[PDB]
Each structure stands twice: as C-alpha cells, then as structure tokens.
Amino acid sequence: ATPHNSAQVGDFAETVLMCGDPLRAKLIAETYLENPKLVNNVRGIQGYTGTYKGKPISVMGHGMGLPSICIYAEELYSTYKVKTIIRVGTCGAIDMDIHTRDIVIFTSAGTNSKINRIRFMDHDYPATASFDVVCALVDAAKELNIPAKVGKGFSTDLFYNPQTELAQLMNKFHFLAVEMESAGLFPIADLYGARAGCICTVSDHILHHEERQNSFQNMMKIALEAAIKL
Amino acid sequence: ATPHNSAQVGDFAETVLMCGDPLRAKLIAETYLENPKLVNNVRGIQGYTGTYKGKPISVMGHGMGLPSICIYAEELYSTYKVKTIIRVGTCGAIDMDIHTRDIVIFTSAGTNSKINRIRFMDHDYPATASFDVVCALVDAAKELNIPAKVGKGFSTDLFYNPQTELAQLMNKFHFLAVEMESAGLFPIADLYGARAGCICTVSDHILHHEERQNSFQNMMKIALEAAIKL
Amino acid sequence: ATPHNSAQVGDFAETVLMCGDPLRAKLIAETYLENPKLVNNVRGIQGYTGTYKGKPISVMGHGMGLPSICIYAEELYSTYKVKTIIRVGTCGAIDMDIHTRDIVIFTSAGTNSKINRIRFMDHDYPATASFDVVCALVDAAKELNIPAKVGKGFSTDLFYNPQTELAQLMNKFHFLAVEMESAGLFPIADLYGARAGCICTVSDHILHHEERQNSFQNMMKIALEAAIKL
Amino acid sequence: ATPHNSAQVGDFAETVLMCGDPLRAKLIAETYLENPKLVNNVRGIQGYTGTYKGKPISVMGHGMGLPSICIYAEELYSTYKVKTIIRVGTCGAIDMDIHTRDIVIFTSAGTNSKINRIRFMDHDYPATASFDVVCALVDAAKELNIPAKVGKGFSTDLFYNPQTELAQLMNKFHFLAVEMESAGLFPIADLYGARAGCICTVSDHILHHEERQNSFQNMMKIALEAAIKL
Amino acid sequence: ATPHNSAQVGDFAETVLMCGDPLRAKLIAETYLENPKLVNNVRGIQGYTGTYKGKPISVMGHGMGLPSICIYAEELYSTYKVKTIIRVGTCGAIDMDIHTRDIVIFTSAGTNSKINRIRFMDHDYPATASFDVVCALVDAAKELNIPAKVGKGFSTDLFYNPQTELAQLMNKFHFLAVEMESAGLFPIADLYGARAGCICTVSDHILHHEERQNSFQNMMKIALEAAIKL
Amino acid sequence: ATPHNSAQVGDFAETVLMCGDPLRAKLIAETYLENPKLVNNVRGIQGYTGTYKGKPISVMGHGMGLPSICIYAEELYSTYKVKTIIRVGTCGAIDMDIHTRDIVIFTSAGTNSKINRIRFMDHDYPATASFDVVCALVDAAKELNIPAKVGKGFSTDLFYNPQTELAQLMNKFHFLAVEMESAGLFPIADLYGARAGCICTVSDHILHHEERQNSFQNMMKIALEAAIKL
C-alpha cells in the first residue's frame, strides 16, 4: 500500500500502540494481544494486529527519531484510517525530581528539530498530546492506581547532544524526560484531525546515572487500558 | 515593591486571575469578589484582592502582548509568591468549527514571538498550560455543565498579522483561537515551579466575521470555581 | 471605530504623544493641554485631545511592549489618519556614559523581537525614527537649550532579560538605553507613509543602580515644542 | 557496550556498510559475505561481520532519518573504532536528467534538518562525503565500468515534504536525489577523524513516477569493491 | 601595517571618503584633492591622502559587499586611528518616488546579510549612520542648496537578488535605494566609538529602468563640504 | 555588457581563473599567459584573456567576500557563457595539521553568510566544488607530483571574526582553511549548469602565526594544468 507498509486499508485497528524497538513491538503483540497477526514487516518494522479484551488493536515499531515516526504516523492516519496512536517507550530523565523507572505521561514535547518550524511557517508550534489521550492515560493510571508523572517531554534529534548546557536548562524549566519522537507525532495527528499521546518509562537519568520490567509492564497496562477507554 | 507593582509580599492571594483590560479586572473584582481591596494601580493596572467563597483571590490586568504579561507574571511568582495564575479573556476564533461566544480552554499555545526561543537556546519550547490548571478548568466546566472546547491556542505578536496565510495554516492544524499572552505566561510558571492556565471567550472569528455577556459570565464561573479547586 | 478605540475619525489630532503608562497620559493631558477632552478610554488607555499653544494635540497610553504599541500605532495611522506619533517615556540606561535622569532621543532602535523579521521577509529591518521627528526633537532641545543624548535605543521583549551578556554587548556598541516600543512603532510609520519618533528620560541604569520630575518635565517640553514644529 | 549495540570492541570490522532496512542488511550479509556472524541485533538492527575477498567487513541497518543514523555512526566511530562507513541504499531522483534505477554517488548532501546548525554554531556546515571514499566509489565504478552519477544529494527530515516548491528548487540547482541520512553521517565522520561516503540506487522519481535488482546488485558491487580499495 | 594596507599609522587623515570603485577613488583624489599622495595600493585599492581647503583628507576604495568594506573600515578605525568614514557611491532606487540621478543620504541601512546578527547575538541591530555625519551631510546639502533625499537604504548581499518580491516590499516600507556596504560600515564605527555616514547618487531604478556626472559632482561637493564640517 | 564588465560575449575564454587581488590577476596574465589582452577593467578588476599551451584562458579579479565574487561569477556564466571558473588564491589555515605554504584543494566550503540560505529556502545548501574540477586539480597535483591537501574550506563574511570559538570548532571538524568566496561561487555554478573549483595557498595560520612564492607558483601550475584538462 505504501513504501513502508505492505498492509492494506483495514489491516490496522483504529488504535495503534507504537515503540521504537521493533522487537519490543513483537514482544508486546505476543505478550498482551490475543491472536496477533503480522500485518506489516517492511523493513522489519513488526506491525501486528490482534485484540485486547475483545477490541481490535495494532502494535508496530516506528524507529528512532522524528523523521522516522513522521513517516509511519502520517501513513497510518492518511492511508490506513487510524484514529489514535499511543507512543509507548523509554526515555531519559531530565528533572532532578524524576528518577529511573518512573512512568511519564507527556502533555506535550519540545524539540531541537526543525520539522515543526518547516510545517508552521517558521513559528513556534506547540507539539501537544491530544487532550483525550492524555486524559485516558491519566485516568487509566488513576484507576490502576499506578503513580505517573504528567508533564513536558523533549524530543531530541541528537541522542548524543553536543549542547551540554541544554540539560540543565531543561531541568530549570522542569522538562520531565527526553525521547525522540513525540514532537513529530503530535502535530501530524492534529493535521489529520486524529489523536496521539505518549507514555514512557524512565530507563536512566541524564544528569546522573542511576525491576525495569515491572515499570515497563505497569506502563503497558496504562497504555492498553487507556486504548480501550478511547 | 517592583517597578510595576506598589503592593508588598502578602497583598496578593496565591491564586490570581488576569485579563488584558484593566477595567475588566476592576469590574470582575466588584462583580465577583467580596470586600475587594485595591492593592496595586501602578500604570492603572487595577490589581485587587478579595475573597470568593471565603478564599483569598486577586484579580489584575496584564496589558496586551507577551512582553506585558511576562513582566507581571514573573513579578507575581518571584516577588509576591503567587502560586497560580489563570488568564481570563477574549480571543479570535481560528478553527472553522469554533464560533463566536464559544469558551476555549487552552492546553497550550503556539506563538510567532521570539521570547521562548530566547529562553530556550533557540529551540522549540512547548508553551504548555499546567496540567492541574487545565484539569481544574475542565472539571469546573463539567460540574457547571458548561460546554467548552479544549485545545491549542496561538499567541500572536501581531494583532494585525501581515502573514495572511497563517490563518488558514492554523485552521488546518486546528488551533482553536488567537490571543496574545498565553505562550509567554506558561513558560514563566514552569521556571518558577508554579502554575498557569488560560480560558477565553471567542469575541469574533478571524476567517469570517460573525449575548456576549452570558458567554463571558459563564467563563468567569468556570475560572472562579476552578480557582477554588486549586 | 476599532476594537481598541471608541473614538471616531477626527477625534484625534494629527500629532499624538504616547507613553506606556495611561495615568501618565492623563496627567500629561491635564498638566500640559488646554481643554483636554477624553476621546478614548477603551481598556483604560486614557486617550485625550486638546490644544497646545492653540494647536490640536492628542495624548494616549500604548501599554508596554512592541505588540501593544503596534496595535495602537497602526490603528491611529490607518483609521484616525494621524500623521505623527511621538513616543514619550522612560528607559533604562545601557551605555556607561549615560546616567539616570539623562534625556535620550532615539535615532533608531534595535530589538530582540521577531516582529520586524516577520514583516521584512526575515531580513534586518532598521527600525529608524523619522528624520523629520529626530530633527524636530533635537532642534527643540537646542532651542530650549536642554542637554539631550542622541543615538540608538533597544526595544526589548524581556524586561527581565535571561541573556545577561546582552547588556555588556550593547554597551560595547554604545546603545544608549532600553525601552519596549520604538522598534515596533518606527516600521509602522514607514508602512503608512507617516512619521514617528521617541524621546525618553533615563529612570535608572541597568549596569549599576543609581529630581526625576525636572528631567521628565524637560523631556515633555522638548516633545511638546517639537510637536508644534512638525 | 552501548544502548544500541550489544557487541564489543573488535566485533565490527574497520569498514562498515549500512542501509536503512535491517532486512536488507541481513540479505547483504548472507548474499555477499562469507561466514557472516550476527554481532548486534539490539532493536533488530541486524549488525553482521564477515569477510569479502578475505577482508573483514560488517554490515548493519541504521534506520531512517538523520537522528537514527547519527546514533549508530557516532557509536561505531567512537566505541567500536570503525574507520570507514559507506552508506548503501535507495533514494528519490530530483534532477530531470536522473532516472529510476540510476546509481548515484554523493559528493555531499544538503538538508532541511537543524542538526548541523546545532553542531556548527548555527552556520552552514557542508555535509561532505570523504574525498577518499568518493574516489574509491568512483574508481570502483570505473573499473567495473558501471555508469554512475556523481553529485549532490539531499537528506530530508520529511519524506512527505509539505514544502512542495523545494523539489523544483533542487532541480534548478541540480541536486541528484533525496534520501534521509547522508547529511548527518558525513559531519560525524569528520568529528572523529574517520571516513564516510554514500551510494544509492534511484527507486523512483519525485517529479514524475516512472530490473530494480540489477541496479541494486551493481551498486553493491561498487560499494564492496570500493570497501576493499579503502 | 595590515594584510590589506601597507600604510602606517599617520598616513591616513582622520576623515576618509570611500567608494567601491578604486578607479573612482583615484579620480576623486586627482580631481578634488590637492597634493594627493598614494598611501596604499595593496590589491589596487587606491588609498590616497591629500588636503581639501587645507585640511587632511584621504580617499580609498572598499570593494563591493559588506565583507569587503568590513575589512577596510575595521582596519582604518583600529590601526590607522581614523575617526570618520563617509561612504560615497552609487545605488539602485527602490521607492517609486525616487528617480535616477537623485542624491540619497542614508539615515540607516537594512540588510539581508547575517553579519550584524553574528555580532549582535542573533538580534536586530539597527545599522544606523552616525547622527553627526547625517547632520553634516544634510547641512552641507542645505548650504549648497542641493536637493537630497534622506532615509533608509538597504545593503544587499545579492546584487542579483533571487527574492524578486523583496523589491516591492521595500517600496511599501519606503526604503530609498540599494547598495552593498552601509549596513556593515555603521556597526563597526559604533564598536570603535567612531563615526560613519553614507551618501549615494542613484544610477538606475530597480523597479523600472530609466548628466550622471552633474549628479555625481554634486554628491562629491556635499561629502567634501560635510567632511570639513566634521 | 554588464554593470561590472565592459567586455562582450566572446571576449572571455570558457575557462576563467579568478583571485581576489586584481594586481595578482594582472601579474598572472603577464607571467603565465601568452598574448594577454585586457578585456575588462571596470572598477580596475583586471580581466584578461590570452592562451596557455595554445588554449584560450582568461584571468580576472573578483574582490573579497561572497557578495563580490557572486556578482562576477553570475555574470560570467550568464552573459559571457563561461563554463569553468577556478578560484586561485590565499587562505588562512585552521586545522592544526595544516601549515603555512601548504596548498589546499577545496572539496566544498562552509560559510557564516546568509546567501545560500536565501537561495535555498532557508535550508542547508552544501556549497560543493564541481567534482570534475576537484578531480582535474587533484590529478594535476598528482601528475606534477606537488603535495596538496584536499578537504573542506570555510568562507567567512568576517575576516575579523568576533566569534573566537568558531576557530577551534572548525579545527575539531577538520576544516582545512578559511577564505571568503568559495561558498558563494559553487552554488552559482550549479544554478547555471556550469563548473567551479578552488585551490589556495596557506598564507598564515589563524590558531598560531607561523618561500611564499614557490608555494604560489606551484599552486598556479596545478590550476593552469587542471584548466587544460578541463
């Protein structure tokens, strides 16, 4: 159907969970989905579709970086008529009050990428998670009674950031953590009148290096339950 | 105490409602507050402090534009130890599905200003409303059962915008409305570990010109009730 | 007539003096004008019209910041057919040779705002005061024999500037003082084929904190006399 | 060893061929390498090491987009002491004289990404392929007598580019094709005093949609032979 | 003494007239100066020093473009202790009310160059002509009773400008003419606490192609007389 | 024919050597060309045309800075139908491994100028030397067996660069040397489907100040021989 997806319209559920690691997407499909069927493996992206509590749901990788997830997200909303994309993954803690293993729900994401400036006439576009998705994630967290931090994330184009002062600047402004996709995903959902959200588990702290399964499984529960609520 | 505020630490409540029009702030103080006392009138800004349902609450103008509200907000959090600032005002509808008189609660705000780039090492800072404030405003709206749209706002530096194509671009990305302060306010609250939010009543539509009291009074109810919840 | 002015075409003189503080504009009208009539008080802006030495002259506030004065200036030239706007106000000294209470006449103004880049295809627009106005102000100063410094001003978007190194940079380039409107005003006058100028009294020094009436009254004399010459 | 590579120093040859598609990297290892051993499969990246004509050589995926290849390239030069990285892949023709199936050797690559501006004090960094690698690729092409076009490439952050006019602009300046990694790879090699190059096979034309194996196999021959020459 | 000047401190007068064409500088020295002595001809720049009405005065070329004049101006103020530099040359009319042969005195100059952003922390630096020099030029013009237009100039980096819409934009904002040095010269004078100005004769109109000696000779009279007044 | 060239179509050879110093261009014409005829001296640019080993070849100055060479290069390709321009000149060493008197052949050039961003929709244009010219220069160097370094150059707009940290940054990225024209020349050749290259002799080192004829004569041999090969 597309240069990066061999599936056809209807193969994907209207709600899709995505993570950078394709092997993690495969694990998620085998671990949490019932009757998961591989619907797309172009570039080994591991796109699956099955059901959770009877409802259709797909999971697929999106690679690392805004350019990568921008390709997959745009194709899913445009061609496969997907309605909701929830990003599930790992991130690096920034704020001194955030620690490894904490679960973070992004309200929005800042970025050092030029993509949003390109689509927004060189102005400041606030990559904001869909309010419905943020709410579904927070309610899911409250119902499961799993502690989760809600706030700003930062999508970097440079995992190995040359600008070492940025880290402290983000701590002063209280950005919760860093990942590499949210800022790209959110605006695309807006353009297609669709929805997007993101929830991550802190795998380490960037201002000081600091069981990882429990945290990840708890994050998956929140995302899966929230997907149902949506 | 400051170049723009004659009041002293303690004269302002920890929660302050602000609007551009100083006369509107005076009206609000006389209409909704009990025992409102003028605590600051430097530059005729009309800063008052009284009580709503027994709780301390201040109201004051903030002028028009990011530079203006940036001065007032920073002084309130820094010098007067204010904790929460809720922006109450009017705005211009952008999205074709938004109409005059609708009430909009901003999740975040984009901008064509350079202020956030200056404070964020020339990167994209997502001016995001504090999640607690957004929630308090939405719950207040739900409890009062007053229809309100939640989404992106845009803080322009140019009321009379030379870039006429921006309007349609914002409609495609579904920005709800335009005002001139939010994008400046939100990051300042972050820096001071405090909170900020914004709720506005659409006074007109920019893509086509289209009782205004009811809408405004309903907005005030939401802001006042939300202030109590915070 | 406009969203920020209730007056009608003809209520304003062709020459208007403006200052940020609306109460200062009211004081000026009561102190220096004869038969001052309030012609606009939307948002408590205090717009008056009277006569000085028999000639029609209006005074009104313009709020703080480029966005604010940009709204008022554009409406005055476009709708009220105003020809000359002279900004009268206070400013913060930058240059080490400039001291508190000195009077400064701006030849032009730099800025950290993005407004001029937006209107000038992202290039460098030199916000320049109208040569006629600069001359009228300098001649008025020479005739009244009141010492005044002539040179570059800087219109900041951030009263509380995070970039602390900018201050010394401006001292090296000899910017005289800092305010928050000139850079926005000047280009608008150009666009409407009209005129604009600015004169300020230093209220303090930003590189080191350092009767204020005499200085202000002397500045008013220069502006008023220059208004007549124009 | 690294967050994206489980291999240890010495597992990778000093020369590594990389392509976006991990499955293509696996195919390449099984098709052109002798005794290929999987040395890294974190995130299913398919990193292999074997020999070509007796010489050690590794092949691995790098995902799509500058951020992705930037992570892998930096780790390979820094941690695994790799000396040469040759990017092998597909691209979209821009120039009207370039057609589908043509083989292109990049001298350099332009980009709409902000990464190089971030590492080069906001100036223009010319992402240039290492002259030794360009020469090795061209000589390999000449020796194998396989027609190949040499010139500028463009690394986009947006596969689906909103700026539709850019395509014709690039045709006027004669950019040969578009991909999504080169501009990021080249500067990293420079920083580590190492080498990088890129060769691609045109899979389609962006200005007009237009056996694909022969072209790909011919490209692999050029890259493999050039790797030996280096 | 410098990489571009063989003269020594004292060989240049404190006031120097400069034009792009070195042959024009030689002509000027032979035509208007008494006892002109060649003090610098590195790169055939034709730097001379003589006297006008008994006062020491030097004339020299400065090449075309901001980078070129930036080298010469900085060396003159820094090494040769020059105090005043008056740029004398030709320019292309922009404003519809300006015609070929008109004489223009620049109050300031805009630019599409990045030089001033580099020296001014990426903000808007208003390249402003020294008020003393502007005044001396205007008074000289008034005393000689030679009509001259005073206003904004534009220093382009592109004689052949790809951005064809800029011309009309500058007409709307009333830029008088275009040249290629002023915007670079003015800030340098500021940095050295020295002075600079510019006066040009329109050689053609860019919005429509339209004796040239009289105009040039009249311009020289104004510059020479103004040099004496300074 | 043009505002900067009095010659007519056909007066210039299809291959032109250019250097900043017009006197150097005259020397080159008298020293290496047979029957050199002055074909253009507007602004004393010293444009000559003669023959080298029987083949037509022109030499002319281009002033200092991108704006200057941009004027001359564009006119030569557009009006005089020139096909190849080889820049011959001096430069300042950056890389610690490069020393005074070394000969450098630019593969490409970075810049702090805004010119390429203006012509390339504000993106990163890689000012790349034509591969044919780079090859001709390197082969000429190999045949004459004259040691020459091949790599990145940097075209600065500021000979006297305020950003003192840039020098070390360029050393880390291994830019070979600094000049002031290449980045402007290369893109123009691309636009006209023509060719351009650059070769320079290091006259000094910018990170530490460090017979100059031999080096220059060797550079001329390489350029002249390469011109024949093209």
Ligand SMILES: O=c1[nH]cnc2c1ncn2[C@@H]1O[C@H](CO)[C@@H](O)[C@H]1O
């Ligand atoms: O600290 C981090 N910086 C950037 N990305 C991170 C970080 N931690 C986890 N990720 C996530 O995993 C990949 C990078 O390894 C990216 O896809 C990002 O989403």
Ligand SMILES: O=c1[nH]cnc2c1ncn2[C@@H]1O[C@H](CO)[C@@H](O)[C@H]1O
């Ligand atoms: O359409 C609009 N554009 C910009 N600001 C608006 C608009 N409508 C209401 N406001 C609000 O009132 C002032 C401008 O008149 C600004 O303070 C803004 O917050």
Ligand SMILES: O=c1[nH]cnc2c1ncn2[C@@H]1O[C@H](CO)[C@@H](O)[C@H]1O
């Ligand atoms: O130091 C200063 N920085 C910025 N603005 C100043 C300063 N001093 C006086 N003003 C003027 O008063 C308001 C700010 O308080 C602004 O309106 C500005 O014009």
Ligand SMILES: O=c1[nH]cnc2c1ncn2[C@@H]1O[C@H](CO)[C@@H](O)[C@H]1O
């Ligand atoms: O036309 C194209 N635009 C961008 N990238 C392309 C194109 N053709 C091939 N690729 C390559 O494959 C991925 C995108 O599908 C990117 O990794 C890019 O390198």
Ligand SMILES: O=c1[nH]cnc2c1ncn2[C@@H]1O[C@H](CO)[C@@H](O)[C@H]1O
């Ligand atoms: O129309 C013009 N655009 C740019 N520069 C001009 C123009 N007219 C005269 N000059 C002047 O002469 C050189 C360019 O030929 C530049 O030095 C500029 O100062």
Ligand SMILES: O=c1[nH]cnc2c1ncn2[C@@H]1O[C@H](CO)[C@@H](O)[C@H]1O
């Ligand atoms: O170190 C240098 N920086 C900039 N340009 C240089 C340098 N060395 C030689 N040139 C060359 O000569 C002129 C500057 O004097 C410029 O034309 C440049 O090409």
